[PDB]
Design a protein around this nucleic acid. Structure first.
Length: 1063
DNA sequence: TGTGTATATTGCA
RNA sequence: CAAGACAUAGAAAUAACCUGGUUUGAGUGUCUUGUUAAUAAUUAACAAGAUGAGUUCAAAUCAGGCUCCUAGAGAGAUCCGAACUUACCUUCAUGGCGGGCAUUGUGCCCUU
DNA sequence: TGCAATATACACAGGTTATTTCTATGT
């Protein structure tokens, strides 16, 4: 009949919608005004979820490496201690919960135990120093332990250098760099200023650029502009534009060895290599440097010891009564809290969370104040400012340690053991000894383009290409090149990220430098008639010799463009592809191919460009053609498109589950669009026909107008300029009080229908004004099942953990699931949804609303499953599940007041206000103006007689807001506020303007549906968390006069009240 | 942020 | 003078890494007096006084799922598991969710 | 002598490399 309109105000946390005819005056359906505010939560991005996924895979890989490393030492360790590998696995458990009841974690011999092992080696670095320096035959368990600790702390893999160097001081290798004097003679001042040259380049805190400028002032390309880390020009390497620029940070000389072949020759690597390894290993007492990182930590261990005796003497000499509170006692950020353990008065060790030195340093500064100034006090205060006082080896500050620095200790420890344990040098079928495998395991990490090495089910992101006959074979560092087709899988990694075709949907686009795609741009410009060019042909005819490309070298040429784009840089792939497939090209030909680099992709695919309409690429050639009429309905090429992809537009009207995937939409936008569809799908069907127009307002909107244009094609979607609606609120006096209620979202959607259809194209104003101030809009909240973490991410202390309330470490392990107060557990166990169960408590039939935990959601879907859960776990007598799913934030009507079932509070149910406050339109402007003063704007620069008006207007509002909480719907809440609002009335007058306007907004937090109901009415004398309402878990029929559950559809058109006291 | 949740305080008959 | 050469900055998705952190356990605490105990003096228990140490390691790190067993505080695999989707009712259908007035306080009328 | 209604405290995070989409600038 009469076509209607739909306006939308779509936002990341709420979607407002409105329905109107050609003359506003909202359409009426099911006896309701057809507008409302669909509210929900902002959708979480996948970045956090990806954080745990990669962390899980990293933990999985670290567990395999620990397993494989243990199998290398498995046979030799068994000869002395069979259970050593299993003793380490039994570490968390108390002596009564481990497989073998042995007290100590690692060593359980007669002479040697954990107490004796730490007397010889107080720290792991002390063990490693013995493992490296000493040539005595060590116990294989100690050798394994030293190697194992390096595996736990491998260091970063960012620095590309040659650990393989045996040993060479900076004085020695500089002499080699003096050689090759074919330069402008900068290589000799390498020896002259070597003392300043070595330390300045080694210094790890000097900025690399500032380090670069100062050194050349004494050495006066140059290679002195590359030590920072950047591309290096080959202008001076005995023969500019032939850069093949290598940056020492990005690529290894061995990797660039084929690149530099056929051309200050190679030793310039060593000086840069020296800087990376020895930057952080500089001795302070002397001028030299340590050899291995273990040697640098025993020295740091001894400085911390020397720092401790200074603090102990200072405290005992000056404040001996405060000595006991800082060292032999656990408090906030004292020394014991810093170390994380304490042992005094013969009591057991009190191991807790460790303190950060920032708060620990602050604790000494406040603690030295009561000591009069002296030499030691100034000296200790000096070190704290420098940050070198009482340092610990492990912590967030060890992000500098590279793998090559740790690889040096691995080789030295393994080499020192080969002279004593022959099992490390027994070769095998691959001619690899144990050392060749441990060293390979240590430094080998999967390259970023391989991804996960297995796809048990095709549900993950894995794309690795296993070679034929190598499936279901574990990948090792030595098996990596055989099992995994590294070139083929790296092709997929780039390919999967490539965009899809603009018109066709199943084929990836072609490179923008590909031959046929380079054409499509030029004939597009030919029709327009230059901003485009056809240059790949101009470029590729040099390689092939022939000036004009035939049809047998064009397919030759296009495979190179794809390879030079998919395999950009990383010449081990491009060169391998050419050499094996096409051995015809010579060395200069291959090197010239790497010379040009294109890595951009077009908007269209190869399959689309060669479609048999009656090839579209030739269609732009023979005729002049129109830019968009070629693929429009007026032509036969459009029909050819639909046959290639059987997918239909809009999918199905009633089925559009996840059509938003692949459109590069953030998770907040995807949820915000989807709930918009849940409304329109429910309005166009409740009404008979489809809306003539759709108005919307939130540049990614172009991706949004499109996918909705699929829905209801006959509609005329209109986008209204942002800020146009706010102009209507100004000139036509329609204030928007965002802090009052959520009705503005509906009005914003409603006004969207007004600015539109008038910007594009009586008493019209009166109808809009009357509608704009209506209380009609139906505000719904998206009910859902809570997703995310099952509980808190980290375990809490066993002292703070109690059974039943805290999720154990492992539920399937009876050791953890039964001793939550012994091993700790996960706090705040999140629940998915709620369900209603009727049980007999105190020999009386009552009902309670219990929750289904997120970790039990899948096995608790049926009523029989839920009843069994109540009987055994919840402990209910004769359970009878009446409702199986009460979602989170479900509407409840309790004693006439509407709430939201947000969560739970121990034995209670947390509720939030679901009722909208409605103040008269005159006080809407004052609240909007109150927020700005509380939001930062100052009342000091105000008229002396406009400020007494401020107090009185504020007084009237507080007096009015004291009435809605007294005699209105807002008087039926739990924990009422009206009695308390009058109680603090004398403190509302007796306060400044700013403070008495920061409580008005806090009061308004008690009648807002967007936030949890609570108020910071502490300025007027109440509490910072005031007004929280929380009913009991049990629905006693005598306590509540009524208790419903309003199940509303997303538009709210269909409601269903389920009396929780009956059904 | 903001909030779900355990935890704590406060009357109170 | 718009490309480009680049730089830098941010967002999104994915992959590969590091430092940790957290929890539990290990890293033997020792002396003095007093009280009360077992039994001339000791060994505990407890309380109050003191006192010396301290830097690390091991294992787990969403619950869990997956393969195989010949069912275990078992092996395997090293990847699935914190993002996105769901009102309610049914034969799970392009089904249903009665017909209408109000719209500042959660109502009213006609029907089943 | 609990006990219901109110009010309170608080939570894993800081870096790195690479790719592909997508902007922002000056340079």
């Amino acid at each position: 009949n009469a076509d209607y309109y739909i306006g939308l105000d779509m936002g990341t946390s709420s979607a407002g919608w409105a329905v109107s005819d050609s003359e506003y005056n909202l359409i009426r359906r099911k006896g309701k005004d057809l507008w409302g505010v669909r509210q929900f939560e902002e959708a979480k991005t996948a970045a956090e979820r990806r954080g745990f996924r990669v962390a899980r895979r990293r933990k999985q890989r670290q567990q395999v490496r620990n397993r494989l490393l243990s199998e290398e030492f498995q046979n030799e360790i068994t000869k002395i201690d069979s259970g050593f590998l299993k003793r380490m696995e039994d570490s968390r458990f108390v002596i009564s919960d481990k497989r073998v009841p042995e007290k100590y974690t690692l060593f359980n011999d007669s002479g040697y135990t954990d107490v004796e092992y730490y007397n010889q080696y107080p720290t792991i670095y002390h063990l490693r120093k013995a493992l490296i320096e000493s040539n005595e035959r060590f116990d294989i368990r100690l050798v394994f332990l030293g190697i194992h600790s390096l595996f736990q702390h491998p260091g970063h893999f960012l620095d590309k250098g040659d650990v393989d160097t045996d040993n060479t001081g900076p004085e020695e290798l500089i002499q080699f760099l003096e050689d090759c004097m074919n330069e402008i003679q900068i290589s000799i001042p390498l020896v002259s200023n070597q003392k300043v040259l070595t330390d300045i380049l080694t210094d790890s805190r000097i900025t690399r650029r500032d380090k670069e400028q100062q050194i050349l002032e004494i050495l006066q390309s140059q290679f002195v502009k590359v030590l920072t880390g950047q591309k290096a020009k080959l202008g001076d390497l005995i023969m500019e534009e032939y850069k093949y620029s290598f940056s020492f940070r990005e690529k290894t000389l061995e990797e660039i060895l084929p690149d530099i072949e056929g051309v200050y020759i190679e030793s310039i690597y060593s000086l840069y290599s020296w800087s990376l390894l020895n930057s952080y290993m500089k001795d302070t007492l002397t001028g030299h440097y340590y050899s291995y990182l273990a040697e640098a930590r025993v020295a740091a261990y001894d400085k911390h010891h020397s720092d401790l005796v200074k603090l102990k003497t200072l405290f005992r000499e000056y404040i001996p009564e405060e000595y006991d509170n800082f060292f032999r006692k656990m408090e906030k950020a004292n020394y014991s809290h810093y170390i994380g353990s304490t042992e005094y008065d013969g009591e057991k060790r009190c191991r807790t969370a460790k303190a950060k030195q920032e708060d620990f340093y602050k604790s000494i500064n406040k603690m030295l104040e009561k000591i009069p100034e002296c030499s030691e006090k100034t000296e200790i205060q000096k070190e704290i400012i420098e940050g070198t006082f009482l340092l610990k080896q492990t912590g967030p500050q060890n992000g500098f340690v590279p793998n090559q620095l740790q690889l040096k200790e691995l080789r030295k420890i393994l080499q020192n053991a080969s002279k004593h344990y022959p099992f490390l040098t027994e070769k095998d079928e691959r001619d690899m000894t144990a050392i060749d495998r441990i060293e390979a395991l240590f430094s080998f990490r999967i390259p970023y383009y391989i991804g996960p090495l297995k796809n048990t089910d095709n549900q993950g992101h894995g794309w690795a290409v296993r070679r034929d006959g190598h499936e279901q074979i574990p990948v090792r560092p030595w098996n990596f090149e055989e099992i995994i087709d590294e070139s083929a899988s790296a092709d997929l990694f780039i390919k999967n990220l490539v965009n899809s075709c603009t018109y066709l949907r199943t084929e990836k686009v072609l490179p923008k430098s590909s031959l046929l795609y380079q054409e499509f741009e030029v004939l597009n410009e030919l029709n327009n008639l230059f901003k485009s060019s056809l240059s790949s042909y101009k470029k590729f005819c040099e390689l092939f010799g022939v000036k004009t490309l035939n049809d047998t070298q064009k397919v030759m040429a296009e495979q190179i463009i794809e390879w030079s784009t998919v395999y950009g840089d990383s010449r081990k792939f491009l060169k391998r592809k050419l050499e094996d497939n096409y051995p015809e090209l010579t060395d200069q030909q291959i090197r010239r191919i790497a010379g040009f680099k294109f890595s951009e992709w077009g908007n269209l695919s190869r399959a689309f460009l060669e479609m048999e309409g009656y090839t579209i690429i030739r269609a732009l050639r023979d005729t002049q053609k129109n830019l968009m009429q070629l693929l429009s309905n007026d032509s036969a090429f459009a029909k050819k498109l639909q046959e290639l992809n059987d997918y239909v537009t809009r999918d199905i009207w009633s089925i559009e589950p996840d059509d938003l995937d692949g459109m590069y939409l953030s998770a907040p936008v995807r949820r915000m669009i989807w709930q918009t569809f849940l409304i329109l799908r429910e309005v166009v069907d409740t009404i008979g026909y489809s809306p003539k127009k759709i108005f919307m307002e939130m540049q990614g909107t172009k991706a949004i107008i499109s996918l909705i244009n699929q829905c209801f094609p006959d509609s005329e979607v209109v986008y209204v300029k942002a800020g146009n609606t706010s102009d209507f609120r100004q000139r036509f006096d329609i204030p928007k009080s965002r802090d009052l209620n959520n009705y503005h979202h509906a009005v914003d959607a409603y006004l969207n229908i007004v600015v539109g259809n008038v910007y594009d194209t009586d008493t019209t104003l009166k109808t809009v004004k009357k509608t704009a101030f209506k209380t009609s809009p139906m505000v719904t909240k998206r009910t859902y099942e809570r997703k995310g973490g099952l509980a808190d991410s980290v375990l809490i202390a066993a002292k703070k953990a109690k059974p039943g309330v805290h999720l154990p470490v492992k539920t399937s392990d009876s050791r953890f699931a039964n001793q939550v107060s012994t091993y700790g557990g996960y706090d705040n166990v999140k629940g998915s949804h709620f369900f209603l169960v009727e049980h007999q408590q105190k020999k009386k039939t009552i009902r309670s609303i219990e929750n289904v935990p997120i970790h039990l959601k899948e096995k608790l879907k049926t009523k029989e499953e839920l009843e069994h859960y109540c009987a055994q776990v919840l402990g209910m007598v004769q359970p009878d599940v009446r409702l199986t799913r009460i979602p989170m934030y479900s509407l409840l009507l309790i004693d006439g007041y509407y709430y939201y079932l947000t969560g739970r509070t121990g034995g209670n149910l947390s509720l939030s206000n679901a009722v909208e406050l409605c103040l008269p339109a005159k006080e809407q402007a004052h609240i909007r103006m109150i927020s700005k003063i509380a939001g930062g704007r100052s009342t000091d620069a105000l008229s002396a007689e406009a400020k007494d008006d401020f107090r009185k207007k504020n007084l009237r509002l507080y007096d009015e807001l004291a009435e809605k909480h007294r005699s209105t719907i807002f008087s039926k809440r739990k924990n009422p506020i009206g009695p308390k609002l009058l109680k603090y009335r004398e403190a509302f007058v007796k306060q400044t303007i700013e403070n008495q306007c920061k409580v008005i907004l806090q009061i308004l937090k008690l009648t807002s549906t967007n936030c949890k109901t609570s108020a910071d009415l502490k300025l007027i004398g109440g509490s910072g968390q005031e007004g929280v309402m929380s009913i009991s878990k049990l629905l006693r029929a005598e306590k509540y006069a009524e208790f419903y559950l309003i199940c509303q559809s997303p538009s709210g058109i269909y409601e269903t009240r389920k009396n929780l006291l009956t059904i």
